[PDB]
Each structure stands twice: as C-alpha cells, then as structure tokens.
Symmetry: C5
Subunit: 397 residues, 5 copies
C-alpha cells in the first residue's frame, strides 16, 4: 500500500473508535486493569496534618477489544503508540486522596496487536494516613495507597497486579534512599470493597512502610540536653556562700526552658497522642528543678547563720560524724577599768560566738552539699545509662 | 446486530444529544438533584481567617429524560457508563466558597435505562464559616455547607437528599478520626432561599459539627505554667538577705513573659473575641507579680535595718506574738583612762545596738515572709483546684 | 413539534450564532453591561505589599440581539439557560488586578426571549490599593474596584449599575461580619476614562470601605505594656542599697526591648509612613529609660558614701528640710597608756565619722528617691489618662 | 445585505483564515511587532533569590495581511473586535523569565480594515535580575526586561516601540507609588542578538529602574541602635564598686547581640556581597565591647585594693595631678599593759593602712573612669556625627 | 498560484497530517531526537528535601518524514513555522522529576523542507538529587538530569546531543552568576537503560555541577563566634573576688547557646549526615565550658578562705615558687587587766590569722588564674590558627 504502515494502521484503528465506551464486545465481561506501583521518593510527611506526599511511577495495562489488528496486513506491525487522549482510560484513583499533586502528562500509550494497552505515568499523590509518632524519632509509619475505580463497580472494572507480589514487595531500585525516610517495603493487598447491596468495588491496597532515620533528631535533641546537664553538674562546685550558685542554676533552667520551647515548636506532634521522647525532657526538667531545690536548701542552711541559732546536737552528730565518715572526710578607778574592759570582753565574746555559730552552720551545709551532689550525680549517671540501654535496644534489636 | 451492544447504545444516545440543554421534555418540570455528602477529613481549620478546608465524597443523581433506552433492544443493557463531559451536569455549588480546592476529575458517570444519572466525585472545598474560639481548646465548631444551584432557580433545579436524614447525620465510616478534629455529625437542612420577588432558590445546608481534641493543647499550655508556678513556690524558701531572691523572681517572670508571648504567637485568635483561656494566663501573671511584690516588700522590710529605726512596739506585738503564735513558732591619768575607755564603751554600745535593731527587723521580716508564703501557697492551691474542677466539668459533663 | 421545546429552541438559537461577534445588529450601537457587586468576605489585607484580597458575588446582564425568539413558537418558553462558553461575553475586568484569584467556573447563563443575558459568577479578586495604616489599629481603609472593559472603548461597551446606587451602598446581606474587617459600604461611581484623543473608556468604581476591629490588637499590645509599666512602678520600692534594683530595671528594659522587637516583627508596617501607635511605644521606652536613669542616679548618690565627702550644707537643707517637709516626712607608763588609748580614740572616731557620713548620704538618697518616685508615678498616671482619653475619643466620637 | 454587518464581516474574514500561518503574503517580509510596556506595580523584590516580580500593562500591535477588508462593503466598518484564540499571535516572551505569573486572559483583540491588530493584555512577570544590595537600604536596582521572539528570527519577526522612547521613559501614570519601591524610569533599548552564524534575533530591553524607600528601614535599624548606645552611655554613671556595672554592660551586650541576630535574620542579603550597613553594626558592637572592656579594667583597678599593694608613685602623679587637673577636679604589769596595747596599736595601724591603700586605688580608678568616659563619649559623638553626615549626603546629593 | 505561499504550504502539509502517529515511513526506523540543555539559573536548592529547582533553555530537533516539501513548488520556501500543537512531539521527560514547574508555552516550532523540526522551550524543572552537605558551606553538589523517553523504547525513540560534548560542558553564556551557586559545568552522558528483557531505553544524563559561595555563610557564622570568644577572653580579667565573673561567663554561655540554636534552625541539614562545620561549634562550646569550669575552680579556691584551712606547704611551693617564677611574677587588779587585755590579744590574733589565711588562698588563686588564662589563650590561638589554615587550604588548593 502507498500509505505508510503506521499511518494506515492508525487510520484503521481510530477512525471508528469511540473514546467514551468501555472496550468490551460483551458488556458482561469486566475490564481487568493490571497495575504496578514503584515508589520513587517521600517528598513530605506531615505528621501535624496527617498527610503523606510521595512520588510513584504508576503503570497499568488493560485489554482494548476494539484496538485489535492483524500484523500481516500492516507491514508486520505488532506494537503501536497511540495518544492517551484518543482512547478509553480507566478511572483508577486513590481513595486516600486529599489533594491533587502536579505530575507531568504522558501523551502516548503503547498498544499491541492483540489489544493490550500499556500506560506508564508518574504521579505525585497527596494522601492522608495515620502518622503515629509515639516512637518518634524511631517511628515506623504504615501508610496505605488504595487504588480503586471511583465509579465502575467490580462487574465492570477489576484490578490485579502486574508483577508477582514478592517483586513489588521488595522493589527499591529507584527509591531516593538519601532522604529522611527509609522504604522498608510496599505490601500489596486486594479486597472487594462494598457498601451497597450489590455495589462491590475492586481495591488494591499498597502498604507503603517507611522508617525514619533518627540520627539527626537524636543529635539535635540530646546534645543540648547533655550539655546543659553537664553544666548543671559543674555548677555544684560553686561554693554556696558566693551567691552566684543560685543565679547560675536559674539561668541554666531558663536556658533549658527556652531550648525546650523551641524544640516543641520545631518537633512534630499529633493531637491524638504525644511522643514518648517528651517524657525524657520532663525527666531532665525534673532533674534540673531538683538541683535548684538542693542549691536553695543549702543556701538557706548556710544563711541560717543569720538566725543566731546554734546547730542542734542531733544534726551535728548526723552530719559531722555519720555522713562525714561516709564521705571519707586609785584602786576604785582600776576596778572600774576592770569592769569595763570585761564589758569589752563580753562584747567580743558575743561576736566570736556568732562567728563560730556561722562556722558550724557552714560546715554542716558543706557536708550536706557534698552528700547531695554525690547522690544527684549517681542519679544522673543511672538515668543516662538507662537511656543509653534503651537506645542500644532500639539499635541492635 | 454486528456492532457491539455498548457501542451501538452509546451511538444511539449521544449522536443527537445536546450538552447545553436541561434534560426535560416539558420545560415546566424542574430537574430534581438528589445529593449526598460524606465527610472524609478536616484538612485545615483557620480560625484567624475564618476559613475551613475539608474533603468530602460528594455524589448526586438526577433524571435525564433524553438518555432513555429499551434494554431489550441493546442486549439487555440496563446500566451504562458515559463521559461526564458529554452530558448535561447541574451547576451545584457551595455558597460558602472562598477558594477553589484542587480535586481529581471523575471522567465517567453511570446512566441507567430509565434515565437516572449517577455522578460520584470528591471535592476539596475551602469554605468560610464562623469559628468561635471562646471555649478554646474545648471549642465545638458549627460550619455549614450550603449546596445550591448558582444560576437555576427552584422552578428549574430543585435539590433533595439521596439518603434518609438520619443516615447522613451519623455517617462516619471513612472519616479520618486520628486528626485534631472529631466529627460529631453532619446535619442536613433544606430551605427555599430567595431575594427577588420570584427568584426562589433551592438550598441544602449540611451543618458539619467538629469538636477539637484538647489534650495536646492542654498539655502544651499547662505543663510550662505549672512548672513555672512550682518554681515560684520554691523561690520563697530563699532567704531574703541573700539578695538572689529578687533576681530569681524577676528571671522567672521574664521567662513566663517570653513563654506567654510565644504562646500568643502560636495559639489561634479571633478579632471578634478572645478565648477564655487567656484569663487563666492573666491570673498566673497576677500571681507571679504578687509573689514578686511580696518578695520586694520583705526585702525592703529587712533592709529597714539600714534605717536605724527601732521596730515599733505595735508591729512587734502583732508579728512576734499574734502571728508567730498562729504560725506555731597618778589618779588623774587613771581617771582619764576611765573616761576614754568609757568612750570605747559608748561606741561599742552603739554598734551592738545597731546590730540588735537589725536583728529585730530581720526576725519580723522572716515571720511575715512565712505568713505570706503560707497565704500565697493556699491561694495557688485554691486556684489549681478550681481549674481542675472546671476541667472535670468539661470532661465528664 | 415532535422535538422537545428546549432542544428545538437551542438548535434555533445556537446553530447560526457566532461567538466572536459583538451582539448588535447596528455596529454603531454600544453594548450596555449592567453590573452588580456584592462583597462576601475580606480574605486578606496585606499592608506590607499593598494588596487586598476579597471575594465578591459579581453579576452582569446585557442584551444579545441575536439570541431573540418568539415564545409562542417554542411552547411559551420565556427564559432559557445556555452555556457560557457558547455565547459572546464582555471582557469586563478590574484595573487594580495584580494577581489572578482562583474562582469556580459558572458553566451556564440565563437568557430571555427579548435578548437579556444574565451571568452570575463569584470572583476572588486580588487587587492593589492604598492601605494607609497611620491610624492603626483604628484604620479605615478605602480600596477601589474599577470594573472596565479592557479592550472595547465606550463606543462599543458601556457599563451601568444593575440596582440603584443606594441599595449597592448598603448591601451587607451575606458579608462575613465575624472577620477582622467590618464593611462600612460599597460606593459606586461611573467615569468615562480616557488617555488617547478618542479612546474613551467606561469605568465603574466600587469603593470598598472596610474598618478594622481594634480590640484584639489593643489587648495584645497594651496588656504587656501596662504589665511591664506596673512592674517598673513596683521596682521603685526596692532599696537602693540592695543592688538588685539596677539588675531588676535592666532586666525589665531587656524584656521590654524583646517584646517591642517581636511586636515590630509581627505588626503591619508601610514604607511610606509609620503608624501613630509606634509613638506610644517610644514614650514607654523613654519612661523606662528615665526610671533606670533615676535608679542609677540614686545608686550613685548612695554610693557617694564611698567618696568620704560630707554632705554639702545646701543639699542638706534642700533635701532634709524643704523636700522632706513636702513629702510629709609609774606615771610615765600610765601617760603612755593614755596617749595610745587616745590613738584608739582617734581611729574609732574616724570609723564612726565615716559611718555617719554614709548615714547622711543614705538619708538624702532615700528622700530624693521618694520624691522622684512620686514624680514618675504622677507622670505615668498622666500619660495613662491621656491614652485612655484618646481611646475614648476614638470609641465614642 | 440581510445579515448584520459585523456577522458578515467576521464570516468573510475568519472562514478561510489559518491560525498557524504567519500573516504575510510574501514570506520574505518580516512581521514587525510594535510593543509598549507600562509598569503598574512592583509586587515583590527577592534579593535572596535574585528574582523580581512586577505587574505590567503590555500591549503590542502588528499587521495581519490576511485580515483586510473594504469598509464600504461592510456598512463602513473600520474597526472590529475578534477573539484572540482565532488569529495568529506572535510568541513574544521575556528572556529573564524564571516563573510563570498568573494573569487574566484577554479574549478579544481589535482589528482595523487596513490589517492592524491591537492586543492589550496585563502580565505578571517573574524575572531574575541582578539585585545588588551594597547600598542597602539606599540601593537603586536596575532590572531589565528583554522582550524577544523565542523562536522566530529577525528575518520573520522584528520588534519596535509603539511610542517614542522619551514617553516610555517617563511613563508613570498608573504606577503604585505608595509601595516600598519608587519607579525612576523604564529605559527601552533595541538589539539584534545572535549566537549562530545567521540566527539573528530581535530584542527590546526595558530597563526598569526602581529606588527603595529607606525611611522605614532607617528607623527600624537606627532607633534600637541609638537606644542601646544611649543606655551604654548611661551605664558609665554606675559606680564601679557597686558591681552592677558589669552585669548591666553584659546584659546590654546580650540584648544588642539578640537584636543584631534578629536583624540579620530579617534583613535581605546576597551571597555575592554584604551590604555596607553591616559595617556600622560591627562598629557599634566594637564600641560596646570597648565600653565593657573599660568597665572591666576599672573594676580590676578598684579591686586591686585586694592586692594590698600601695599605688605606684608614677601612677599617682599621672592620675591625681596631670589627668585630675585636666578633668578640672606594779610597774612591770603596767609595762606589759603598754606592750600589749601597742600590739593593738599595730593591728589597728595595719587595718587603717589597708583601708587607705584601698582609698588610693579607688580614687585613681574613679579619675581614670571619668577620663575614659569622656573619651568614649567623644568617640561616640564623632561616630554619630559622621553617620549623620553620610545620611545627609545620601539625602541631599 | 493565487494563494500566498505560506498558506498554500501549510495547507499542503497539515491537511493530511496525523498528530498521533510517529513520523517514520518505515516503523523499524527509530526517531532520533537531538537535544541541547543550557542552564539559566539555580532557583532553589533544598538540602532538607533533597530537591533541586533550576531553569534551563531546553531545545530539541528531530526529523519529520511527513513534513517534507519541495521549495521550488512553494516560492522557494526552505523554512516554515508551524504550531507545536499540530504536529507529533516526542515525550522526552526527566526521570528525576518530583514536581511540575510552571513554564511558558512555546506555540510554534520551526520546520525545514527536508523534515527537520526545531523546538525551543524553557523549562522550570523540579528534580530530586543527592545534596550532600558534608563540606558545607564549601560543598560542591552533583545533580543529574536524565532526559529519556518515558514510554517509547530505543527501538522507537533514541536521543543524542545537538552540539559537541565539550561545548555543552563549558556553556555558561546566560547563567545567572550572581546567585548563591556557581555553575562549574554540565557533563552529558548517554546510556541505554533497561529493566526488562528487551525494553531498552535511551537516556541522556546531564550532570549539573554547582559550587556554593561560602563567604556569606563564613561571615554570618564566624563573626558571632569570634566575637563571643573574644568576649570570653576579656572576661578572664575580671577579679575572681568580684563575683561578677561567674555571671559574666554563664550569660556568655547562654548567649552562645541561643546563637547556636538559631544557627541550627537556620542552617541546612540532612538526616543522612551532619556537616563538618558542626564540629567547630562543638569545639567552641567545649572551650567556653572549659573557661567557665576554670572560673568556677578559681572561685572555689578563693572562697576556700571560708574553710579556715591554711594553704598546704606543697601547694604553696608549687604555686608561689615554680609557677610564679615561670610567670615572671592594786597589783591584783592590774594583773586581771593584763589577763583580759591578753584575751583581747588572742581574739585579734585569731582575726588577723584568718585574714592572712584568706590572703594566702587569694594569692594562690590569682597565680593559678594567670596560669590557666595563659594556657587557655594559647589553646584558643592554636585552634584559630588551625581553622585559618583549613580555610586557606580550601581557598588556594
Ligand atoms: C424541592 O424538593 C424538596 C425536597 O424533596 C421538597 O420538599 C419536600 O416536599 C414534599 C412535598 O411538598 C414534602 O412532603 C416533604 O416533606 C418536603 N421535604 C422537605 C425536606 O422539606 C420541595 O417541596 C421541592 N420544591 C419544589 C418547588 O419542587
Ligand atoms: C454610559 O452609561 C452611563 C450609565 O448609564 C451613562 O450615564 C448616564 O447617562 C444618562 C444620559 O446622559 C444620564 O441621565 C445619567 O444620569 C447618567 N448616569 C451616570 C451615573 O452618569 C452614560 O451616558 C453612557 N455613555 C454612553 C456614551 O453611552
């Protein structure tokens, strides 16, 4: 024939084709759409809004009973490319859609002589799923993509898998693995959904399992916390008499509060439940408050010298003997002169006695400060070891 | 017939069909559109802009008097799928629209032999409603969706419900319940709206009632507040003489002010009215200011020792007797020597008297500090109990 | 006739209709477009960018001389609905456009037998206007919407009002009154604009007058300011000798500076002129600086005791008499003993004299501190009363 | 003729017209497009991304040799409106495009009997240019708009100006002058651009010169700076012995650092070069650091009294004579008594000598503090005067 | 011929042309698309999301075997412009697409008599690549653009380069060089990609190498750091007895922590690895912590005077001899009088001895403070020199 083979075949196919008619000679035969999903990247995970944005390479093929031809009559053409906007295309969508992502339009599809139509197209899908951040930053999310025909029931359109389920499960060839999220697998699952008495719908659920990389968050959260805790430990060495100890502790607490406020404003959160990491921040705040309370108690005990109250005997024993051991620690004119110089005696006696009372109070305060510093340091060490053990469990288990 | 049944039926229907003509043989008969609304998710609630963004699964069916056929003449076809862009579609819109949401296009609709046309399509609707945050974070919003034909009057297009009102009221099958907002119900209501003398319009109002989950806000707001209040309580134990008490209190107040500024910058607000939660922040600020004023008063009273003024007798009685009980608390040369050593007497007398005056002032200040600390602690406890009772009322009522 | 009346009428009208031809039999006759504007909501007012975003319900009608028919020939059809995309539509736009808002498309328009065409459509219009914030937060903005035919001159398209000007002026039926902005009126005004010698253009200017609700801003700005001013007033009671007064004042000033920086970063501003509210912040900062300067002066005066300089007589009189009244306030060995004990006399004399000089300086400083505190309190009260009077004028005038 | 003149003319013109053919009878004749640009507003200037967003009223006219008619044959019609989407339109674009702005579509164009086609359309153009902020906030930007035919070479499409260059240069009729940027002029310039051997392209470059209004930035930057500098000046009056001077200075420096960090986070910047205004901030920081260093030096000099080191004679002379002038400032028992009371002599001697050494050190420190305060105040005054002179030069030159 | 040459040629070409058929007479012959890429600007580099946004001037040409004509039959027309939407266009896309950028549409393409079709069009491409910020701010990114036919295999569409690889490699004519990123080169590379047994795909990978300009980041990060380090150095001069040293150091540390938090919130970061610049911030924080620990140790050593413990002999030797050298530093009544005045002796003895013990402790503390200040200054100088050497290596290597 004079005309080119491709042109003649396209004229033979599309001159009598109806775009709005489902391609089945017998209307009782459903149109089976075999789909495949390849996850490319996790563009954004919005735990606040429970919205997942991901980019996939979606492809589907079905049988077009009207687009069939004999290759021998068209120069042995067995495969042909036809515009997408000139043939019937199933209305396969995702139930979890909450927004329309902007994706490039694929103008052509492949068609084979026996009727198979191959449609490859990438999709930016904005889907809402359950983003539980209880184990944040070690959370593993399980978001599902439910591909289903929005209108046509299973008696018209049914859905199946292009490849074997195992291959889809472990398909990670083109995934952007350098991002915050690691793709564990894509689990397919078929279900015949229904709400009406006979309106049964075909669904293919792809469970996109993604695991967060916690090292960035672990650093950005722990490092300031351990720095402030170390500074708190160092602050104990300041003598209680200097007075700068209270200012140091309160300034450190203010800095920690500012840091925690910033962290809360920056970290993700969900209204249904708070992450477990927030408990550790509360524990650190409690430790800092305990340190400041101990500092205030020691300061008050030292200033009790201003009470002019001799140290009780029982406290003396308890602190300086038990705890200290535990811590490994003209005659008439002359007689008038005598009487007055004894008044001087009595006044200097009183001043020296006040000084010695302050001495005793200060010694007791220092001993108790050493004891409480040791106790607080041991508690902090135990808490740090417990946290490290939890991290090791999450790391190696 | 040689041609496929679906192709022949589509040709028989759409070859003479006019897309821009309302499908009624008699123009006096209105076209009744039975709609249904299923709320899927509350994407965003903007109290600042009074804008609500939600995703719904909207579906409507009407009768197309031109798209009727006899099944026996088309291989017993009783249901057919036809492209949406090839048939008349009512211009049902929402009055509350302030923006166009991006929603996937459904290319096909279902058509039955007797003329019924079924159109399923999801809609991201950006609607403006009254978001009163007076009871924030326990606010229950009542936003209405008014589906109405923008142009056609009731003499042309009328609207009704697909399902019974009760089923629509309690339809929560696919709602995303893990979000910040909980769906209480969707109340439908029909109204024949009108502004002109004869331009009566059909309206179907769906009242989307959503309740906020307050636990997240409750925690994020109370926990810093109770932490700072506890720190304020601890600060009372600092002795007034140390001087660090004033610095502690002012630093705590500065931290609370910064926290409140951040909270205001982060919490939602409306220009028509402030939330009731802002009163509790003002109460906490007043409590902190009262604490600082008491600290300043005690500091001034203690420093009154620098006034060299003996304590008044009435104040002495009132504080050290009533309140304290309530709180369960060569001759000529020798005579010259005598005269001078008595001058020494008088100077040490004066110094000791000054010290004793300071003693009395300090004792009075300490007693009053204990009293005011007890009073402030009782007031704080009462306020906390009242707040807890209010929360319990909001929780169990 | 066998065919339906609506179908026959649509065929009779649109089969010979040209969409791109202005509908006038005589080209010398202009096409008069009667428009109407109903403001629905003020979505956003951007004082920084001088951009106004509002949602309106715009509707226009004109006469289509080609779309005329005799009702008696079409089953007494006097009103018909025709797709918008099948008839000529005027290119009415707003000159103030700076952006294209996304608005739902209305597919149908109403047509009557005598030629009138009714087009209802909502519009999200992003327009630039003069947003003067001089009276912020009590500013009343006056933004104009100039509807005009972009291309056609007045010899082709002319514009008029659908309703009477009074009704348009007071049309507030569907306005969202719960927002930050209150709609005072929509004033229409017609003008025959021109730039060329004969290119006269029809314009219809709608002056959208909106008034801001200041209560939210009034609270969010005054409450921190009055709180900090009250704290400054309380700080005067701290004795100058404690030394904590300077730290208190400087910390308060730092907090106020941080608050003012945040307020400036959050409040709207224009490069052409600053709001009058900024003057009051400067006044408050000046008051705080004056308070700190007075505190520093009193501290220096008290520490002048370290100068070992007796108080000048004139200052003594002025402060302790005038101002205080205003404020309602072996012989040789024995003689050697005598000589030395008189050396002791002289040393204790000097120490006591130094103490008394410090006494006098402290008394003078305290009296002057009381005076300056009274003066500053009176000035603050006067400023607050003036501000309250200004607010009352803005409220009741 | 029975048909309307406009309808008949449109049928005569557009029935044989090809939309995709350049309108020239002789293909060797280029199509000359006369353009005009009117700047309406400067929507956004992004110095960070080097992106300029502006709104212009662009209009162009060319000759359509196929759309010609004799007015006498069509009821003396000399001007006609035709849809834009039905005639050939040149592909004039801007080379500097980096984004597509959303602009309203103009559906109609004017056509005259001799072939001229007038196309008016507004354009929101997002263009990238060189935004040098070296003279910020007094920077004058010079951004170019290069209108050129993307595909057609000069042998097909050539570009010229609608109006005279002078009129375009001074066209400021509709510019929004209330914004941050002031339009100085729009300079046109034609160039025959080329890269290949014969692919010469016509370009029309419009140089949009815009000048920033600096008053807002000048205030928002200077006022905090001068306030903090004044506070630093006041801080010198605090006596060095009080100890609050160091806390005051360090708190002021912390506040200035926070302010500078916020300013840097808010002010625009470019990676190619920093603005000159940053030098003045560095100078202010250096001044504050010098003030704090002087305060620390004076504090150390005063505390040298704790060194028990008498003031060197040379320092005494230099400070208290030169600089001070510049600043305008039983026998055995009795002998035992004698020996011991002389031991008392020696101890009180030592205490008084220590006090006098502290006296001398304090006097020297006070004199040097006065000197350095005068020097620092003079330096600050000189810097402020220099800055004011620079501002006056930028204002009046 | 009467008709215009261009019109006649367009009619001859496009009247029988099929838009959806690949232009090859023999379907076995692949369509070779020669592409070219010119990078215009780097709009945005998102290290957080691993997304690159760039603007390129993409152009491709291929052979259209159906659009061929003899110039002599059409008035010697050798080149023609035809609308893009009227001819077959290959579906060349970028694999790395994650979003659709908005780019102007080019309506026309050039066609030559022998069949070559030239298509010029700009593209805003949003592509995901590996943005390693390990060497930040001196990082050199290597992002690839893989142009490939999405559907057609290599047996249908193959891709080649328009120009020589060297010219494409060094094409920087129109690049916006004033931005944050500098373009080093664009390296092309061809690959026959494949996943199936016979589905081989043609790919052309352009490696866009961009280098960041670090001067802005270098300044904005170092200048605050060096300022705070200098302030820390100055703080050592404060005497330990003043007590303001601890407050100064803790305030400086708080300021540095706030600065570091802001820097972290502003600087880019990746979850796969932290930048090396973060180590230097940790080193600076460690230096500040060491300085504060030294200050606390010196303060405690000085306050040890409150321990009433004479300085150990070994410490005395070590500090005041070795280190100091290294640093280049009636009888009965009279006898009663005697006994009591000797009691006075003993009390003043004790007071003076306490004073001398404090003297010794203070001298030791001052000497050790000088030593540790010298050591810390030397360490800081060494660290600064090492950092400067690293910068010089990065600058000149
Ligand atoms: C428009 O439709 C509504 C809903 O079907 C009609 O309202 C119903 O009218 C019937 C008959 O009068 C009543 O029995 C129902 O109780 C009504 N339902 C409701 C919810 O009001 C309405 O009459 C229709 N109007 C027109 C003009 O057709
Ligand atoms: C364009 O329309 C306006 C509005 O209808 C016309 O203005 C009116 O003109 C009539 C007759 O001259 C007056 O009686 C009215 O008072 C005018 N109204 C206003 C608001 O000005 C205007 O004349 C029309 N112009 C043309 C050229 O048709």
């Amino acid at each position: 024939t004079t005309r080119p083979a491709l042109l003649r075949l396209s004229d033979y196919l599309l001159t009598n084709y109806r775009k709005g008619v489902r391609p089945v000679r017998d209307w009782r035969k459903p149109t089976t759409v075999s789909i495949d999903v390849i996850v490319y990247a996790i563009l954004n995970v919005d735990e606040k809004n429970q919205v997942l944005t991901t980019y996939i390479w979606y492809r589907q093929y079905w049988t077009d009973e009207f687009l069939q031809w004999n290759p021998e009559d068209f120069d042995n053409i067995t495969k042909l490319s036809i515009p997408t906007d000139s043939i019937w295309v199933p209305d396969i969508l995702i139930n979890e859609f909450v927004d329309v992502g902007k994706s490039p339009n694929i103008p052509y599809v492949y068609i084979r002589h026996q009727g198979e139509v191959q449609n490859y197209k990438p999709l930016q899908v904005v889907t809402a799923c359950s983003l539980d951040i209880y184990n944040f930053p070690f959370d593993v999310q399980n978001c599902s993509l439910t591909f289903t025909s929005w209108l046509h029931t299973i008696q018209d359109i049914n859905i199946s898998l292009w490849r074997l389920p195992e291959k889809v499960k472990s398909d990670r060839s083109v995934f952007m693995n350098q991002g915050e999220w690691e793709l564990l697998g894509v689990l397919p699952y078929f279900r015949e959904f229904s709400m009406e008495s006979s309106n049964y719908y075909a669904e293919m659920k792809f469970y996109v399992v993604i695991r967060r990389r916690p090292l960035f968050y672990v650093v950005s959260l722990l490092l300031p916390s351990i720095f402030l805790m170390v500074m708190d430990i160092v602050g104990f060495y300041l003598p209680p008499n200097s007075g700068e100890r209270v200012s140091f502790k309160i300034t450190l607490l203010l800095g920690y509060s500012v840091f925690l406020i910033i962290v809360s404003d920056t970290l993700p959160a969900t209204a249904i439940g708070t992450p477990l990491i927030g408990v550790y921040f509360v524990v650190c705040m409690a430790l800092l408050v305990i340190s400041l309370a101990e500092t205030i108690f020691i300061v008050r005990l030292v200033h009790k010298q201003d009470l002019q109250q001799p140290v009780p005997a029982w406290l003396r024993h308890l602190v300086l003997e038990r705890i200290a051991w535990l811590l490994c620690l003209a005659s008439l004119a002359v007689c008038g002169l005598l009487q007055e110089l004894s008044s001087i005696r009595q006044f200097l006696e009183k001043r020296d006695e006040i000084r010695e009372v302050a001495r005793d109070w200060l010694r007791v305060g220092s001993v108790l400060d050493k004891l409480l510093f040791h106790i607080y340091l041991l508690a902090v060490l135990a808490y740090s070891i417990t946290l490290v053990m939890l991290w090791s469990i999450w790391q190696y288990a």
